[PDB]
Design a binder for this molecule. Structure first.
Ligand SMILES: *[C@@H]1O[C@H](CO)[C@@H](O)[C@H](O)[C@H]1NC(C)=O
Ligand SMILES: *[C@@H]1O[C@H](CO)[C@@H](O)[C@H](O)[C@H]1NC(C)=O
Ligand SMILES: *[C@@H]1O[C@H](CO)[C@@H](O)[C@H](O)[C@H]1NC(C)=O
Length: 2003
């Protein structure tokens, strides 16, 4: 014995078993790898996105001026990131555009031209000209001296003397007109009157009114400025300006719209490093867009065109070109509603009018610019008239500039003057000098200014219209929006049209359409994305759509209407900076596919392990191993290692794939391997538990995978409620292994995100705050579920005259028994001995099995006394079960093993090393006779060789006692002789005990016989002893040829004491008396009997002895039928009852037809009802508290200034932020509270150490955070400790929020470096994150305004205009009266800014409101208690517009396209529960039996279908009831309910016949049920989803065709019809439901050849075609010879005189297609009436094909056979009414009772209704089944089934009867009881045809035999005729002081040929041939002798002995 040596044998056996599949061995290692290859493809099809830091510029609101507003719109269109803090997020700076060339140039000009202390006297020259050319140069009419006039004058006056003066004219006048100091004096009352003007050539005397002289005051000014102007124009700023303006003025240049935009950006904007980065969005699924993912374009239909009245022609001709162009089509749809929009303000009343009038400043100042540009229309030509024909320019600077002093000045001018060019650019009019440089500048400025004026006419700038109720506003809004000219609409919901006084709390709502506003269902993203949410298009609809602008305008109007503060402040929006991140989209699908894929990859190993475990116990191969001495623990521990040695090799490759495939980058693969190992262990140890519920292999292999998969689903609904679940309950629900796998997978993903994997040091830790459930807990829960399952499985397995012949003094006894007792054994004393077989003959339950069990050591006796080879059975067991060997009734053979391993395995189990086992294997394999085919598999042997091997194994090892029972039951007679030889070669020195129920066997091989009748011995002795200790006549048979009266006298001479005991056809059995002398007489009789044989007319004469079975029994105690229409109408109503009684009392096909459909439809219907609706956008008041608990910082920049120290007070204390804690109401859901004082938090002393020791610079504050490197990519930076400086002060406001001062601190540092530390605590779920910080307000910041005031500018403009004669016109006088209010509103000086975080959708407009609401309270007078005023904003969108409802409808019907799939998959469980019954009935030949009784397959199939429809209707009605119960529309409405009922019924109508041809292709119900519910699901998923998802592509011009052909080609499937019908009934209702919203009547109806009308016709058509296909497929399945045989062959030529026959069988044969030797040759026999034929047949020669022909199974190839005139070649339906049948198998329905099981087969024949009552009772009483008459057949013993089969075969009164093994598993009493019945019908006149394996019954009741050797018949005749003619024998036996030599001496002389026989101490057995000479030669005596004859069994062995 041993343990570690038993484990080795079991493990070797399992390893050898596993290698021989080679399909399991390949799939188990390939399937997971192919499952995980897609998870690598997904990795490679989802790249990784990383980005650096982001700092964004700020956006100016309209309240901050108009120039900054427009500049911020133009610069920040793309919202760029910058990597480096912008200048706008500093304590005082707001400007952010301090780098444009237009600002550097202005700074240079303001620096070195203006602010010039050098000259500063250009004003002096201005004053000079302003005083001169007003009085002295003009002097129009004002009186003066003689020398002065308008344009020309002379001083020639005051002369009195007649006229050297020519010389004076030459000297004083020198080539110069009126436009000499002493020359006239030198030439000199001539010397008194010549000179009058004492003022000489000196130039400065013109304004001699009171006092004025200024002529030589220019020199320094016009000689010092020019070098500085040169230096200014040669500054780098002007270099950049000119180098950028080099294009945009040339030709063939600015059209690429990227050079132009680049120029404008570089000239107005000033952004560095290229411009920015434009972070993207990538979500698309937070909006349910479904076409940003699917490739479809999402663009609304372009709006209508109409030639608009009263606008312009140019603008109107521009709109069409700009709107129909394919490029600028979407960038103009986003801008049109702002430029040309319109605003509506429903409550028309004085208060609303005043508010909207105050909110009108922006458009007013934008109209002032249009007026200012239009003024050029008049200014232009007046300026032009100043340069061509002008009394100033052309007459002053063009006539001269003199010609002499001007010449001298030009010579002494600057570097280059070119006075000729100075005159060419001085008004050349009649010249046309064309290089010219003067006309082109004016020519270009006019043509570029009128174009601007022409564009500016398109804008609409009066865009407020009033109504008087909201409904008219909504109507007008949709009317305008169809044209795309709708901006928002304003509604004041708290004032009537007569309101005049504003209440001190104003509320309004902005109403826009949903394409330009964030949705009001959600306030967050459902799934947290690592990204700033800074995409200018998909993330900022509140800015590019115009919500924020209009909100600001209305807030400013409401403020200005009730304050009158006259000191404005603006608003700037600034977005919080964001750290660097890494966005991985693969962690979304890994977390969802890793557990699914892992659970799905063992779905086959689980099934193939449970199947093996269950099968090994189903074949009773486990109790055998226990009998040999193997415990249960060893079996378990070997199955474990068997299943575990493969999963290890699989995990080792899965780990390699997962690592090297980049699915996990950095994870320490050892932990991953050790993590999958625990899952494998739990899975195996769960297979062990699942193996203890099932009894069949197929059912277990089918249900195991399904149960395994089902046990994981509690994790899918456990990943939603992830936050409510406490860890204490996470540990309780984790007792299921597949959910403990997912719980660890989540932590795996969370660790992989962070840049650091598992690494052996954080598996015990968690990436959370207080979860307490780590990654170790998952592994430790799996390794505990393993043990729990193990204990549970192990536990649940256990609970479920003298009689005793005098012996010899001794021949070494081997097994003694003394006074054995147990309770049915009363003191029996048996003593088995050595080297002789003993036949333990007994009853079938009178005490044989119990004593065999006692002797075989499996149960204990009470107080008996046993012995085994000199040992006991209680004191020692481990030593006795070493030589004791046994074999049971069944077989002990492992499939997929060979003979060699069988012998070796059992030899080693008995306890023997490998060498002895391999030695004795080669010895037993010789005696067994299996030298060849020693490598053949255990299965696929002959079928008798398996029994040979089974009994050969019983002798393996050192065996002494062999207790084997029924060793040769159910085998052909030749293999029985083979096994007998085996036994006879092994009783050399070993005791053998052989229990059997056949008595033909217990004589030829048996030396002692013992009978246990009443639980005790009664008789024990050799067969001769028993045959003599009773005394019976020696049976004398006699046969005749084709006269008892004269035959009686023959034996009358030697009259005995018995006569003709029995006389059957051509037979005569005689019975003589035993003993009583009769020495000579008896011998003499066979003298005249053997002599005159022919003369008398006999043919044979035997003389056998009383059979051994005879004594055994002693020592134990049709009217006229129906036909035609009545027959058919009775067949149908009998089959209906048979199929009703089977289901009325079964539970499997009750919950397979009622419970599953309702359950699976109920779950789907609830799934359809717990999904939130799509659309339905509510109001949603906007305030910062719609988010939870949060931080809101604060900062007070620029202190000391008044009106800000009160603004910072009414923001913190007083009313607080926002509008919560008012003083009266404001929402009851959000109450008030109470506050705490300022409190700086505490820090670890190491932090306060590191800040007071090092040197931190203004540019470099507290240490920086580490960003992801090339190989370590982290979701968020690492941020070392002490990252944002010291914590700031804190409070807890009355509105329950912590605000914190950030004064005197760097904000764009604190915000960047402390954000990860907040997300790391607000995370732990990744769903609906809080972010804990959404905004804050920074008070202060001013930008520099223009110093140039108003009136001081119009003074300059007016003077410049008046000095050159322009004076403007009527447009100028109206455009210049508004200038000191226009130059004031461009820029607002002091203004605040608000920080917002875009991760919350509504956090922008929530804090803009807070800022405006604080500005209101910062300026009201000092007697109004600012805790009463406020403003609230509501954002209620506008009605959907029938184009945005199509998408809502698609998303709505998408959830009914899943209910359709579930209904299809749940209505297919009912038709698959009928194919199971059909499959079970096709096998076991129960359908063939009804066909034989005659059911004409048409009626069979029609009745089955007619019952199936009615059975299915109940489930259909139940499903309809559930649908009615849910009260859903579109199905349960009064109009659609018929459309649902007619859709569910026709589906069954169509699909039931479609699965009927699947009953022919399967043999196991479970495999069919698995393969059907998968094919139906596969078809039903793809027939109702492909067509759904292929209709969304309105383009591609080939999808709408490839779908339109599928819509008419997929209709051959009844799944598609139902799916499309159920989807159509939802789509039609949706379409007719969106219309009722607009007030319409769609009024559609089904049954219209487009909704379901075509489907309801296709189903009817294709339900009557598959039935015909079923009928067809069921139509396409259903020389040298012995003289005696030749005599019949030649006699069967004239069947005219002997046509009384009941079987002709003319000629038959069955040549197979793939064969050449026919299985049946030409044969021909007649069956006279009153005889039963044999038709024995050699095994392996072909005999069963004959019954397959006769019954009607196969085709009779070239045959001819008739029963009673009707042939079995054409007329095979009326003949079947004259033929019974008892099949070899048992065709019984195990749910019906015997009585009704007889009623069915009675009704299938005729026997009208009122007589089955007696026909049945007759059959029941005749067959002796009264107690089991009605007891649910199937509970029957196994022999009772044979009685029932015979009873249902004998029904009515058929002339001919076929029997096929009528008795197999019966005790002899039942066998005789049944044989009497078979004789009692042949004794009436009806023929019988029998076939069997036991020669005993063929010899007990028969009249003719015929043995079918390989070809055709070989012999024929009666029993005695065959015995004599084909045999010899008369086996003689004699008893004894014995001496064998004297007995052998007399047989030495005579009787030549005796092959002697078995030898014993006194028993001799010989064999004479045929002479009957012993009976007369046995006078010479010296006590017992008997002369039997060879049995009929020995004759069959003679024929089978060859071949
Ligand atoms: C603007 O930029 C100039 C140089 O480009 C610099 O001297 C000046 O200080 C800047 N002004 C502000 C407010 O940053
Ligand atoms: C705030 O209200 C009063 C202050 O007088 C105080 O009694 C109360 O406890 C404070 N807290 C709350 C929650 O009311
Ligand atoms: C700060 O304080 C300790 C004290 O020496 C220092 O060694 C270490 O770097 C820091 N420890 C912690 C827990 O921050």
């Amino acid at each position: 014995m041993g343990f570690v040596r038993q484990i080795q044998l079991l493990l070797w056996k399992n390893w050898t078993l596993r290698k021989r599949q080679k399909i399991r061995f390949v799939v188990e290692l390939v399937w997971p790898l192919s499952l995980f290859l897609v998870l690598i493809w997904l990795r490679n099809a989802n790249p990784l996105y990383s980005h650096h830091e982001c700092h964004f510029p700020n956006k100016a609101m309209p309240s901050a001026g108009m120039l900054p507003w427009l500049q911020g719109i133009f610069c920040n269109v793309n919202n760029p990131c910058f990597q480096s803090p912008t200048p706008g997020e500093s304590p005082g700076i707001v400007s952010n555009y301090n780098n444009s060339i237009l600002a550097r140039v202005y700074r240079d000009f303001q620096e070195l031209l203006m602010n010039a202390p050098e000259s500063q006297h250009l004003g002096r020259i201005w004053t000079e000209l302003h005083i001169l050319s007003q009085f002295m140069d003009t002097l129009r009419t004002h009186p003066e001296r003689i020398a002065g006039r308008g344009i020309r004058i002379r001083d020639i006056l005051k002369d009195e003397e007649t006229l050297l003066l020519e010389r004076f004219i030459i000297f004083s006048q020198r080539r110069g007109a009126k436009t000499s100091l002493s020359q006239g004096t030198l030439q000199w009352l001539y010397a008194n009157v010549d000179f009058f003007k004492l003022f000489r050539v000196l130039p400065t005397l013109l304004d001699s009114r009171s006092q004025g002289i200024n002529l030589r005051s220019w020199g320094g000014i016009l000689s010092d400025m020019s070098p500085r102007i040169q230096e200014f124009i040669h500054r780098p700023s002007m270099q950049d300006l000119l180098w950028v303006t080099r294009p945009l003025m040339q030709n063939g240049g600015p059209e690429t719209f990227t050079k132009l935009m680049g120029i404008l950006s570089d000239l107005l904007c000033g952004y560095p490093e290229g411009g920015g980065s434009r972070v993207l969005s990538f979500n698309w699924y937070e909006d349910n867009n479904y076409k940003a993912f699917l490739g479809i374009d999402s663009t609304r239909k372009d709006p209508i065109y109409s030639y608009d009245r009263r606008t312009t022609s140019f603008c109107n001709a521009l709109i069409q070109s700009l709107e129909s162009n394919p490029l600028t089509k979407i960038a103009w749809r986003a801008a049109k509603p702002l430029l040309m929009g319109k605003i509506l303000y429903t409550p028309d009343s004085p208060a609303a009018r005043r508010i909207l009038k105050n909110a009108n400043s922006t458009f007013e100042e934008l109209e002032h610019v249009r007026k200012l540009v239009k003024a050029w229309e008049e200014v232009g030509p007046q300026i032009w008239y100043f340069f061509d024909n002008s009394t100033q320019m052309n007459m002053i600077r063009d006539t001269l500039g003199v010609k002499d002093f001007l010449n001298r000045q030009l010579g002494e001018e600057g570097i280059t003057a070119e006075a000729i060019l100075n005159f060419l650019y001085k008004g050349p009019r009649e010249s046309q000098a064309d290089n010219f440089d003067w006309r082109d500048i004016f020519n270009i400025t006019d043509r570029t200014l009128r174009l601007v004026n022409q564009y500016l006419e398109c804008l609409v700038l009066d865009k407020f219209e009033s109504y008087n109720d909201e409904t008219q506003l909504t109507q007008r809004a949709l009317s305008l929006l169809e044209e795309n000219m709708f901006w928002a609409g304003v509604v004041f919901p708290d004032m009537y049209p007569w309101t005049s006084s504003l209440p001190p709390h104003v509320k309004y709502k902005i109403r826009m359409d949903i394409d330009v506003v964030e949705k009001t269902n959600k306030i967050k993203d459902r799934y947290w994305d690592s990204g700033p949410r800074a995409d200018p298009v998909e993330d900022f609809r509140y800015i590019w759509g115009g919500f924020a602008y209009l909100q600001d305008m209305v807030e400013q109007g409401i403020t200005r209407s009730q304050v009158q503060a006259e000191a404005p402040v603006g608003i700037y929006l600034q977005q919080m900076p964001y750290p660097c991140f890494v966005d991985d989209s693969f962690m979304i699908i890994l977390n969802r596919c890793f557990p699914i894929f892992m659970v799905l990859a063992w779905i086959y190993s689980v099934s193939m392990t449970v199947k093996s475990i269950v099968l090994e116990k189903e074949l009773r191969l486990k109790e055998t191993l226990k009998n040999q001495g193997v415990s249960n623990a060893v079996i378990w521990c070997t199955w474990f290692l068997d299943s575990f040695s493969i999963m290890s090799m699989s995990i080792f490759l899965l780990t390699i794939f997962i690592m090297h495939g980049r699915i996990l980058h950095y994870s320490d693969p050892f932990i991953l391997f050790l993590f999958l190992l625990a899952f494998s262990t739990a899975t195996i140890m769960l297979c062990f538990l699942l193996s203890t519920f099932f009894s069949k292999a197929s059912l277990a292999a089918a249900c195991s995978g399904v149960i395994y998969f089902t046990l994981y689903l509690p994790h899918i609904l456990c990943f939603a409620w992830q936050d409510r679940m406490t860890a204490e309950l996470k540990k309780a629900v984790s007792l299921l292994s597949p959910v403990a796998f997912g719980f660890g997978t989540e932590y795996l993903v969370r660790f992989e995100e962070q840049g650091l994997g598992l690494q052996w040091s954080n598996i015990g830790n968690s990436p959370t705050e207080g979860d307490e459930f780590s990654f170790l807990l998952s592994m430790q829960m799996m390794l505990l579920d393993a043990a729990v399952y193990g204990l549970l499985a192990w536990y649940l397995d256990q609970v479920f005259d003298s009689f005793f012949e005098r012996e010899h003094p001794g021949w070494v006894p081997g097994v003694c028994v003394k006074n054995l007792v147990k309770i049915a054994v009363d003191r029996l004393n048996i003593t088995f001995y050595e080297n002789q077989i003993t036949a333990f003959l007994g009853h079938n339950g009178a005490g044989k099995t119990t004593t065999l069990s006692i002797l075989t050591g499996l149960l204990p006796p009470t107080s008996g006394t046993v012995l085994v080879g000199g040992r006991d059975i209680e004191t020692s067991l481990d030593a006795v079960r070493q030589s004791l060997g046994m074999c049971p009734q069944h077989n002990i053979l492992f499939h997929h093993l060979t003979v060699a391993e069988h012998m070796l395995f059992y030899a080693q189990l008995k306890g023997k090393s490998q060498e002895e086992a391999q030695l004795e294997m080669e010895a037993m394999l010789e005696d067994t006779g299996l030298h060849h085919k020693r490598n053949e598999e255990a299965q696929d042997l002959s079928g008798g060789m398996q029994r040979k091997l089974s009994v050969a194994i019983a002798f393996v090892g050192d065996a002494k006692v062999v207790i084997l029972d029924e060793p040769t039951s159910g085998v052909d007679p030749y293999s029985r002789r083979s096994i007998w030889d085996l036994l006879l070669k092994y009783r050399s020195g070993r005791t053998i005990i052989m229990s059997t129920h056949h008595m033909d066997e217990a004589d030829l091989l048996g030396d002692r016989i013992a009978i246990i009748a009443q639980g005790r011995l009664y008789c024990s002795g050799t067969p001769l002893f028993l045959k003599n200790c009773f005394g019976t006549g020696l049976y004398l048979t006699l046969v005749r040829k084709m006269d008892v009266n004269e035959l009686m006298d023959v034996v009358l001479h030697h009259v005995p004491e018995a006569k003709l005991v029995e006389c059957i056809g051509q037979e005569l059995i005689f019975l003589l008396p035993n003993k009583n002398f009769k020495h000579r007489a008896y011998a003499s009789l066979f003298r005249e009997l053997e002599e005159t044989l022919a003369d008398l007319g006999l043919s044979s004469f035997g003389i056998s002895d009383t059979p051994l079975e005879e004594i055994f029994l002693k020592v134990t105690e049709g009217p006229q039928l129906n036909t035609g229409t009545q027959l058919v109408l009775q067949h149908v109503q009998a089959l209906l009852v048979k199929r009703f009684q089977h289901t009325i009392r079964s539970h499997k096909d009750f919950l397979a037809q009622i419970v599953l459909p309702a359950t699976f439809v109920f779950l789907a219907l609830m799934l359809s009802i717990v999904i939130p609706p799509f659309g339905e956008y509510p109001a949603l008041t906007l305030h910062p508290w719609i988010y939870g608990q949060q931080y809101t910082f604060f900062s007070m920049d620029e202190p000391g200034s008044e009106q800000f120290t009160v603004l910072a007070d009414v923001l913190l204390n007083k009313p607080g932020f926002g509008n919560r804690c008012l003083k009266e109401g404001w929402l009851p859901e959000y109450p008030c509270g109470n506050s705490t004082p300022w409190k700086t938090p505490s820090v670890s002393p190491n932090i306060t150490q590191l800040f007071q020791k090092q040197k931190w610079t203004q540019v470099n504050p507290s240490p920086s955070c580490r960003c992801s490197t090339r190989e370590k990519l982290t979701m968020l930076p690492e941020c070392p400790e002490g990252a944002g400086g010291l914590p700031p002060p804190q409070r807890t406001q009355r509105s329950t929020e912590i605000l914190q001062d950030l004064t005197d601190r760097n904000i764009s540092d604190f915000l960047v470096k402390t954000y990860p530390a907040l997300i790391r605590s607000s995370l732990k779920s990744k769903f609906w994150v809080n972010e804990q910080r959404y905004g804050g307000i920074s008070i202060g910041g001013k930008l520099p305004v223009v110093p140039i005031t108003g009136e001081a500018l119009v003074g300059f403009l007016s003077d410049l205009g008046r000095i050159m004669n322009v004076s403007g016109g009527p447009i100028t006088r109206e455009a210049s009266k508004e200038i000191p209010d226009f130059l004031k509103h461009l820029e607002t000086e002091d203004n605040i800014k608000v920080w917002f975080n875009n991760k919350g959708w509504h956090a922008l407009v929530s804090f803009l409101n807070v800022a405006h609401n604080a500005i209101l309270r910062a300026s009201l007078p000092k007697d109004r208690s600012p805790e009463e005023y406020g403003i609230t904003v509501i954002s209620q969108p506008l009605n959907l517009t029938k184009e945005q409802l199509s998408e809502i409808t698609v998303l709505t019907t998408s959830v009914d396209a899943v209910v359709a799939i579930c209904v299809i998959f749940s209505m297919s469980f009912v038709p698959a529960s009928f194919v199971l019954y059909l499959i079970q009935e096709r096998v076991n030949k129960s359908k063939h039996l009804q066909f034989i009784s005659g059911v004409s397959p048409t009626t069979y199939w029609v009745t089955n279908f007619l019952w199936d429809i009615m059975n299915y209707s109940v489930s259909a009605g139940l499903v309809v009831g559930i649908f009615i119960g849910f009260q859903k529309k579109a199905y349960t409405s009064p109009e659609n309910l018929p459309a649902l009922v007619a859709l569910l019924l026709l589906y069954g109508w169509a699909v039931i016949p479609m699965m009927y041809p699947a009953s022919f292709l399967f043999d196991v119900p479970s495999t069919a049920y698995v393969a059907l519910s998968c094919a139906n699901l596969f078809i039903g998923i793809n027939s109702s989803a492909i067509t759904f998802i292929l209709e969304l592509f309105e383009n591609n011009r080939t999808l709408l065709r490839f779908n339109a052909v599928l819509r008419k080609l997929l209709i051959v499937f009844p799944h598609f019809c139902l799916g499309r019908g159920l989807i159509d009934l939802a789509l039609s209702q949706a379409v007719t439901d969106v219309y009722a919203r607009f007030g319409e009547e769609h009024s559609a109806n089904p049954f219209h050849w487009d909704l379901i009308g075509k489907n309801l016709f296709a189903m009817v058509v294709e339900g009557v075609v598959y039935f015909l296909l079923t009928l067809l497929v069921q139509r396409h399945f259903f020389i040298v010879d012995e003289d005696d045989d030749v005599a019949e062959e030649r006699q069967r030529i004239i069947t005219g005189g002997n046509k009384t026959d009941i079987l002709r069988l003319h000629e038959l044969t069955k040549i197979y297609p793939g064969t050449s030797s026919p299985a049946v040759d030409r044969l021909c026999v007649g069956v006279r009436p009153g005889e039963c034929f044999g038709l024995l047949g050699v095994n392996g020669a072909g005999k069963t094909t004959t019954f397959k022909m006769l019954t009607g199974d196969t085709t009779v190839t070239s045959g001819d056979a008739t029963v009673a005139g009707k042939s079995i070649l054409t007329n095979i339906s009326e003949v079947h009414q004259n033929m019974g049948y008892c099949p070899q198998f048992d065709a019984i329905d195990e749910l019906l009772t015997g009585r009704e099981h007889l009623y069915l087969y009675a009704r299938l024949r005729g026997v009208p209704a009122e007589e089955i009552e007696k026909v049945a009772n007759w059959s029941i009483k005749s067959l002796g089944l009264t107690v089991y008459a009605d007891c649910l057949a199937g509970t029957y013993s196994g022999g009772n089934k044979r009685k029932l089969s015979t009873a249902i075969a004998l029904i009515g009164c058929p002339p001919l009867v076929l029997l096929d093994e009528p008795t197999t598993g019966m005790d002899p009493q039942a066998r005789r009881m049944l044989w009497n019945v078979i004789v009692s019908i042949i004794r009436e006149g009806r023929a019988v045809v029998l076939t069997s394996h036991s020669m005993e019954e063929c010899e007990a009741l028969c009249t003719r035999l015929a043995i079918m050797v390989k070809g055709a018949f070989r012999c024929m005749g009666t029993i005695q005729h065959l015995k004599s003619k084909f045999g010899d024998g008369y086996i003689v036996t004699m008893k004894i002081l014995p001496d064998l030599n004297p007995v052998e001496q007399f047989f030495q002389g005579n009787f030549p040929g005796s092959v002697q026989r078995e030898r014993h101490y006194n028993m001799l057995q010989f064999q004479v041939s045929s002479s009957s000479l012993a009976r007369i030669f046995q006078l010479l005596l010296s006590e017992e002798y008997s002369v039997t004859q060879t049995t009929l069994d020995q004759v069959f062995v003679n024929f089978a002995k060859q071949q």
